[PDB]
């Protein structure tokens, strides 16, 4: 038999973990014990960039990553996660399957040994804070935690906070101690992490839509039989249908949940946020050397 190893930043009890253990089970059942999936959550193997690097070198088998996170290796791919360019999961998924998307996926595999088998919806990122965020000006001087990603940095920068990069494991503490005033993430993680206990405000900023690609190492993939490949692809699709699905349900419920935990929810006017991004889009086209902004936004 073959036991494949998957690493993730998400912790047990997250929507990401429940799907991978569900994924573990499905392969574990449909393969009659011949494909096993060992899980290494909570970033014990490193962050997604480190785990992506392990896949490229053949040291780790499976990992999660967003399609825009592929910009670490294929710069044009960062465009899909540019703030507010992507409207919804359907728009983002259309990018993933477009000729542009297939081009990135071909380059991922055969320069970097990454097989994107599917991509799931993980939610639209909102902004939490210890003070209310009614307008674009409530961001001025806000110490906003962001991840270890340029476009989250740009979002914070262009609405006017001073961004603070921080690893996903350290965030709850920086909010509890008010070492940082706010952070930005999708709602299902905001609860699972219990970000809301230490956060008094929820600022519906809808600034970035996150996907949740399942990537297998290409060197591991060619090591499987054709029968195993089908079980995996389709099992992955099995959990992805559910996972994407679970997220939409929660994002529909949890805004009310946070209210019931005394969270103040603010729907600020987004037009100045979208306007603040125009110089960023222009510049990105120039940095790639070819326009892709206008193409992606129109998909």
């Amino acid at each position, epitope marked *: 038999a073959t036991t494949l190893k998957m690493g993730m930043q998400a912790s047990v009890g997250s929507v990401e973990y429940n799907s991978a253990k569900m994924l573990a089970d499905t392969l574990e059942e449909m393969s009659q014990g011949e494909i096993k999936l060992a899980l290494y959550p909570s970033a014990q193997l490193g962050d997604d*960039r*480190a785990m*992506l*690097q392990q896949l*490229t*070198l053949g040291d780790l088998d499976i990992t999660y990553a967003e399609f825009g996170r592929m910009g*670490l*290796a*294929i*710069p*044009r791919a960062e465009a899909v996660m540019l703030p507010y360019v992507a409207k919804d999961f359907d728009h983002l998924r259309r990018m993933f399957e477009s000729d542009f998307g297939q081009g990135v996926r071909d380059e991922m595999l055969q*320069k*970097f*040994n990454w097989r994107a088998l599917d991509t799931w919806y993980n939610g639209t990122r909102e902004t939490t804070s210890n003070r209310p965020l009614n307008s674009i000006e409530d961001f001025k001087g806000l110490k906003l935690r962001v991840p270890n990603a340029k476009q989250n940095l740009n979002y914070a920068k262009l609405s006017g906070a001073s961004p603070t990069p921080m690893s996903f494991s350290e965030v709850y503490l920086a909010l509890q101690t008010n070492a940082v005033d706010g952070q930005e993430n999708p709602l299902p993680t905001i609860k699972t992490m219990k970000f809301y206990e230490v956060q008094k405000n929820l600022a519906m900023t809808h600034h970035i839509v996150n996907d949740q690609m399942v990537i297998i190492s290409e060197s591991t993939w060619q090591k499987l039989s054709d029968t195993d490949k089908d079980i995996i692809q389709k099992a992955v699709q099995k959990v992805g249908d559910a996972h994407t699905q679970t997220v939409k349900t929660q994002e529909a419920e949890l805004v009310s949940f946070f209210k019931s935990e005394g969270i103040n929810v603010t729907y600020p006017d987004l037009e100045p946020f979208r306007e603040a991004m125009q110089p960023l889009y222009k510049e990105f086209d120039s*940095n*790639i*050397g070819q326009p892709i902004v206008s193409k992606l936004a129109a998909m």
Partner: nanobody
Amino acid sequence: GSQVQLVESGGRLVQTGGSLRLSCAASGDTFSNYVMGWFRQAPGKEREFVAAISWTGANSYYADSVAGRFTISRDNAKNTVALQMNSLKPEDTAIYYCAADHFHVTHRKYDYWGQGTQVTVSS
């Protein structure tokens, strides 16, 4: 997109047991986006990987040929990568190449390359 331009320096004539520090200056695209690598080639011979360093310097990779003697480091403020070579022997004689890629890779070329600097180790 925008690519990286690399220029190595430091190449010299040195003695057996001597130490030499190579440096590579990077320009163009953002230096912190790239894993920086050092490679060496003798007349003929297939590219030889020597060392590489991750974006933040947290990971380093080395060839068994140099694992104890050579040290790679980077400076993301000055946009440079350096290779400290110690206990050189004449078989270390080569053109040493600075290379950049978004990730450390072994199945292929690095994407971007410098012009090389010649190191001669005398017996």
